[model samples]
Each structure stands twice: as C-alpha cells, then as structure tokens.
Target: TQYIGRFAPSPSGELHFGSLIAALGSYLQARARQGRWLVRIEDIDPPREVPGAAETILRQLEHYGLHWDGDVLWQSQRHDAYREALAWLHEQGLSYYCTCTRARIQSIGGIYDGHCRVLHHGPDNAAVRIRQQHPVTQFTDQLRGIIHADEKLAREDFIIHRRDGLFAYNLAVVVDDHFQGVTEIVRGADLIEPTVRQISLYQLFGWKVPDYIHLPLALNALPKGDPRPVLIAALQFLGQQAEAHWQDFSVEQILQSAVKNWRLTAVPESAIV
Candidate 1:
C-alpha cells in the first residue's frame, strides 16, 4: 500500500530540539518510502493552547525546511467530523452516555469501572464513552515488537467526548486519520502505550489498522561531546551514523543523503547510551 503518514503536533509550545528530531525522522520515513507526509494541528484542547503557538509552529517548520506534503489540517476546524463519528457510535450501540464526574471516578480510582455503561443517562450533561467489547492486552509494534499492557487499562470503557462538548484526543485522532487514510503512524515513544487504545478505536470504527512505529524519545542533546550541526545532531539522535564530510552539506543536501543512507538497522533497538 502507498504509505500515508502524519506528524501530528499540538499547538502547546514552540518546536524545541526534541520535537524537531521527531519531525525530521517522520519526514525521512515518509520521503524515503515515496509517500505522502502530512501535518495535523492537534488543537482540540483550547484551554491549554498557547497564544500564537500555532503560528510559531508553522514558521519553525518552514525555517527547518521540514515542508509538509499538503495543506495543514487543523483539528479546531474538524468539529463536524467528530460529531459524525460520535453519532455513528451512538446509533450502532457501540458507545454510551457518561454522566460520571472526574471526582466520582477518581474517588474509587482504579481504571474506569464502567459505572455509566448501563445508566443510559441519555445525553443530559454527559460525556460519551465507547464500550470496549474486546480488551486488547497486546499488539505488535513495527519497531519494538509486542507491547503488552495491564488488563484494566486494556478493557476499560474510555471516554470519546468530554463534558465540555469537546472531542476526546483518541476519538478525534482516529477519526481525523480515518478520513485522511493514514496508513501508518510514526511518532515518539511517549505515545507508545496509547497504540493499543488507538487500535481499539480502529476496531470499534471498523477502520484498517495502520502500521505503528514508535521512535525513541529524543533526549536533550548535550553540547559537551556532541557539538554537531543542528541537522546532523538530530540525525545522530535518530541513530544515523554521520558521513565524514556531512558538516559541509546544506540542510537539504544532508537530508537527501540521509534518506539515501537511512536504514531501520541503524536505529538502536534499545534506548541511547
């Protein structure tokens, strides 16, 4: 299948070095496979969004030459799509109204015990949660092999819509990518565990399961012994061994050659030393 990958980032802050490394790696993976690389703004949570953060993120991508393939997709503009997904779930009886409060859940405090699944609160000050028909304890990661999780976490009925009338991240993300035809997901290891949650959503929606690659988290590059150029530095973090004269190449040149030399074997199977 033609590879359709995405680098979805939240507009919470400026693109720092760690995030830049992630961007470059995803860009390389998509480019190397001759696939489409798209960017989506995960701006669903306005309460936590920084003022002008989205604008700053766009400029930073341009500055770094990490050009995206198509027009940017902003989640804030995707309310109708999210609504459609929720409605579909409701009609199919795959989801339920969740009138449970945060304190209510936290007080008993294990994973959600599905208190509202049978309540049938019928949308009165309620959030929405999908009934997890099948508990997913494990799934294969393209890079990391089988990822297993606790049974409670794997089986819990998670929310799809919040009480504030906002789309949940997992719901919005899967729905957003569902329409975009995301064939694979490549992102930081910080997102590794949620792979199962996403896969569960895919099953619930009957969408194809996209291949997942969980890249290592980028640590702060120390200047003490690794004073390479910014581009080279990010590549090194991605586990690409540097070419001898790579210092002389332009950012574009370096990226071009890096794609040519990029190998899955080069990425460390374990964390950095």
Candidate 2:
C-alpha cells in the first residue's frame, strides 16, 4: 500500500513543540516513502475546544513547513458519517444502550461491569457501547514493536455514542480513518492504550487495521545534577510560549525539513526527554 499518514490534532490549545515534533516525524515518514500526508482537525468535543484554536493550529503547521496534500478534514463536520456507522452497529446487535451515570460506575470500581449489555433497553436516555468479545491482548507497532495491555481494559465495553448525543472519539476516529483510507497512523504515546480498542473495532467491522507507530513523548529536561523539580517553571514557560508562537511557521517548510531528515531507524522505542 502507498503510505498514507495523518496528523490529527485536537483544538484544545495552540500547537506546541510536542505537537510540532509529532507533525515533523509523521511528515518525514510519509515523504520518505513518497506517500500522501493529510491533516485532520479532531474537534469532536465542543466543550473542550478553544475558540480560534483550530485556525491557529493550521497557521502553526504552515509556519513549521508541514504542508498537507489535500483538503483538511474536520471531525465536527462528519456527524452524518458517524451516525451512519452507529446505525449499522445498532442493526448488527453488536452494541447496547446504557444509562449508567459516571458516578454510578465509579461507585463500582469504575470498570463498566456490563450492566447494560443484556438490558435490552431502548435508546432514549442511554449511551451506546460495543460488545467487546474479541479483545486485542497484544499488537505490534512499527516503531515500538510489541505492546500489551490489561485484557480487562482492552475488552471493557466502551461508549460509541455518548448519552448527550455526541459521537465518542473512538467511534468517530475509526470511522473517519476507514473512510479516509488511512494506511498508517502516527500518534503520541498517550494514545497507546486506545489503540487496542481501535484494533478491536476494526476487527468487529471487518476493516483493515492500519499500521501504527507511537512516538516517544517529549518531556521537560532537568539539570544534570539536580532532582526533577516538583514545579517545572522553565518547562512550563517554554511550553506556553511555543503554544503561542507555533502559528508563525508554514506547514510546507516544516514538512520539507521532515522529509529531508526523517529516519525511522533513529527513533528510540522509549520516551526521550
């Protein structure tokens, strides 16, 4: 398959150094393979979105020289596709509706104990959840090699559509990726656990699971002879400044540098601070 990678960034804040690192790495990989690279704004959660953040993110990408191949995809505009997928899942009897509140679930150790799987309730006041039968115990990353997670967490029933009528991130991402024909996914280490659930979703829908590469997280650097500070004031300052200034670069410039210097073999398996 021709390489097709994407940089899906949420509009919670302006793009920072961490976000730029991810963009640069993914762009380099795609360009090295002479593949198409795309950008998608993951703005599904409206309440968490910062006003003007999406626009700022785009500008930042441009400033960093990370140009995209096609029109940008915004998750907020794909409600119809999400609904269609949800309807299909509902018809297949592979999902159920649950009205369990967060507090109720927390009272019981927070591991959704399948309270609504067999309830056979209607969808008036409930959230939709997939029946996770074929849980992914382990998967291999192109960069990280083998990864394993708790079977319980992997198989735990997760929400597809929230009770508040919003599409869940898991459902939206899988559907969008499938529709976009994404062949490879390059993302942060924070999303490693969710990859298991995503793979399970691909299995359930009979869709091909894309190759995944979880990049090392960028962390605050400490002085050589000093203990890690409880309060990383300098790191925090730099982070805030990066977020404010990322929009000054262009995506084309960033991507050009990435393609010129990208080396997958050079990436470390563990986090690099």
Pick the TM-score winner: 1
Clashes (N, CA, C under 3 Å) per candidate: 0, 18
The pairs that clash in candidate 1 are none
Estimate the overall C-alpha local distance difference test score of candidate 2: 0.77
**C-alpha TM-scores of all predictions:** 0.92, 0.85
Please write out the lDDT profile of model 1 over residues 83-125, one tens digit for every residue.
9988899999899998877888889875788988888888989
Off by over 4 Å in 2: 221-258
**C-alpha RMSD in Å of predicted model 2 compared with the true structure:** 7.3
Give residue 25's lDDT in candidate 2 (0 to 100): 69
Please give me the total number of clashing residue pairs in predicted model 1: 0
- How close to the true structure is residue 258 of candidate 1, measured as C-alpha lDDT? 84
